[PDB]
């Protein structure tokens, strides 16, 4: 009944799932009481019996290794709140740095037309539209990614400059291909073998795995599309540089904050 001993006993159940258990319980509590992270600092009290069971239910869930932001319904990315749900890849902080590089190439070159392949929640394309004048054409294989990328564009007021269509690669936007000046993606780039079948996966496997190699996506993309006149900027795996060089030579690779190779960049824009 007293909320802080609930917080303290819950935090211990999440010990083996996260480094920040008190925080996750604070976020879950807030999510269930429908209150604000910030307004949890009432020194005595605040919790009903239905509310109590609910929190313990979600805490047991989280203890199984189920993603926190699925429970929260939301993930913060580039300072914006993206809705997420079971069935959508949850945006990662690493990807922020792709967006900042993208915005900087838009600023330098006066780019008006961008694509986001594999848009998921809309994280890249929506942020790009929110913070530039560019129009963004986005795709995904998943109906749930499409529906949610749409609602996130609406949520951040860029439904007029961010358009999502179900399909693979840029197949649904064939008629726009010539006008597209920059193609961005954070594609599935994980090896099929990095998943031991004993371990649970809570995110959609089409969002994570690029065949045995981890490179299927890049092989098919760079075999199917002529990128003359275009800039391609895509998140990659850690150990994938040398093998990528064999798929698309001419590429530059960029290190992230943490000092490792995370993005490929193929600038074939003319003068």
């Amino acid at each position: 009944r007293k909320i802080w001993s609930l917080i303290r006993d819950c935090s211990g159940k999440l010990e083996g799932v996260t480094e920040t258990s008190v925080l996750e319980v604070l976020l879950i509590v807030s999510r269930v009481l429908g209150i604000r992270k910030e307004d949890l600092f009432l020194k005595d009290l605040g919790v009903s019996p239905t509310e109590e069971k609910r929190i313990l239910e979600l805490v047991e869930k989280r203890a199984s290794g189920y993603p926190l932001h699925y429970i929260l319904g939301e993930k913060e990315f580039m300072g914006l709140s993206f809705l997420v749900e079971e069935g959508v890849f949850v945006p990662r902080p690493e990807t922020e740095e792709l967006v900042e590089l993208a915005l900087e190439l838009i600023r330098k070159y006066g780019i008006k037309t961008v694509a986001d392949i594999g848009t998921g929640s809309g994280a890249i394309g929506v942020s790009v539209a929110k913070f530039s004048d560019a129009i963004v054409f986005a795709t995904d294989v998943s109906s749930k990614a499409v529906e949610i990328a749409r609602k996130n564009a609406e949520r951040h007021g860029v439904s007029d400059r961010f358009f999502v269509r179900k399909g693979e690669f840029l197949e649904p936007f064939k008629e726009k291909f010539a006008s597209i000046e920059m193609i961005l993606s954070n594609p599935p780039y994980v090896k099929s073998s990095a998943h031991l079948p004993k371990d649970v996966l809570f995110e959609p496997p089409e969002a994570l795995f690029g065949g045995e190699d981890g490179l299927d996506f890049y092989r098919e993309f760079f075999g199917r599309y002529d990128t003359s006149g275009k800039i391609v900027l895509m998140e990659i795996g850690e150990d994938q540089v040398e093998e990528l060089k064999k798929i698309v030579s001419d590429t530059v690779f960029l290190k992230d904050s943490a000092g490792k190779y995370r993005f490929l960049l193929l600038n074939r824009r003319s003068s």
Side-chain angles (χ1 to χ4, degrees):
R1 227 170 304 185
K2 195 164 269 73
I3 173 177
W4 292 103
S5 27
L6 187 43
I7 277 146
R8 185 256 195 317
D9 310 312
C10 290
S11 77
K13 314 165 124 55
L14 303 177
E15 276 309 64
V17 125
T18 177
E19 328 268 72
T20 60
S21 58
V22 167
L23 170 60
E24 302 217 3
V25 176
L26 292 181
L27 290 177
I28 282 162
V29 171
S30 138
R31 164 51 147 165
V32 359
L33 314 188
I35 208 155
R36 226 176 143 95
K37 288 191 291 195
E38 287 96 358
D39 317 327
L40 286 173
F41 297 101
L42 285 266
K43 301 212 209 83
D44 242 335
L45 254 9
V47 68
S48 84
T50 21
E51 284 170 346
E52 188 176 329
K53 180 42 140 26
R54 200 21 181 176
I55 298 170
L56 281 136
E57 257 160 37
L58 302 176
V59 175
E60 197 178 24
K61 253 258 232 245
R62 182 61 192 124
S64 87
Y66 195 77
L68 174 75
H69 300 288
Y70 284 171
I71 291 170
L72 308 182
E74 235 184 87
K75 170 69 166 105
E76 164 99 337
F77 175 98
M78 290 288 311
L80 298 170
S81 184
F82 290 77
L83 308 157
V84 292
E85 279 184 348
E86 216 182 316
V88 186
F89 186 88
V90 179
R92 313 290 210 261
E94 282 77 32
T95 309
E96 294 189 336
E97 298 189 31
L98 193 139
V99 176
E100 293 157 4
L101 288 168
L103 294 166
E104 134 174 91
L105 293 158
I106 284 147
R107 273 198 318 272
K108 170 175 187 212
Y109 289 119
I111 288 170
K112 282 315 216 232
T113 304
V114 186
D116 179 14
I117 306 182
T119 192
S121 63
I124 296 181
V126 172
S127 294
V128 162
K130 186 68 159 143
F131 302 139
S132 77
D133 288 311
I135 77 118
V136 185
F137 295 129
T139 64
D140 211 294
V141 295
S142 158
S143 294
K144 197 105 210 134
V146 172
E147 165 184 66
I148 284 280
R150 265 180 208 141
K151 284 209 205 17
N152 285 318
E154 182 159 273
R155 171 181 256 233
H156 295 289
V158 292
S159 296
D160 61 354
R161 289 197 294 103
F162 173 91
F163 310 94
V164 53
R165 287 178 188 174
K166 178 160 139 64
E168 83 176 335
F169 295 105
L170 294 170
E171 291 314 89
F173 283 101
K174 268 184 211 146
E175 77 290 11
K176 305 290 182 195
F177 183 72
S179 79
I180 287 170
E181 299 175 71
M182 182 180 227
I183 299 164
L184 303 179
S185 186
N186 168 32
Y189 49 68
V190 191
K191 294 141 186 276
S192 268
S193 90
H195 189 225
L196 301 185
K198 75 175 191 56
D199 290 305
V200 68
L201 245 225
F202 300 99
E203 284 179 303
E206 330 76 56
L208 302 152
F209 302 116
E212 313 181 356
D213 231 349
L215 295 157
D216 285 352
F217 173 93
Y218 307 102
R219 258 194 296 275
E220 166 108 284
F221 169 74
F222 282 109
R224 194 173 197 193
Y225 293 100
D226 177 6
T227 52
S228 311
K230 304 199 190 297
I231 296 172
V232 180
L233 176 59
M234 305 189 164
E235 194 173 310
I236 64 162
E238 250 198 291
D239 293 315
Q240 285 174 329
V241 168
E242 294 305 302
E243 220 44 27
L244 279 158
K245 283 184 187 162
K246 299 189 192 185
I247 296 176
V248 47
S249 57
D250 280 343
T251 291
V252 163
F253 296 92
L254 309 165
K255 289 189 159 165
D256 67 2
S257 295
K260 27 178 53 36
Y261 286 119
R262 247 44 248 284
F263 317 101
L264 79 73
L265 178 61
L266 175 66
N267 182 352
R268 289 177 60 198
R269 193 176 174 78
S270 42
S271 301

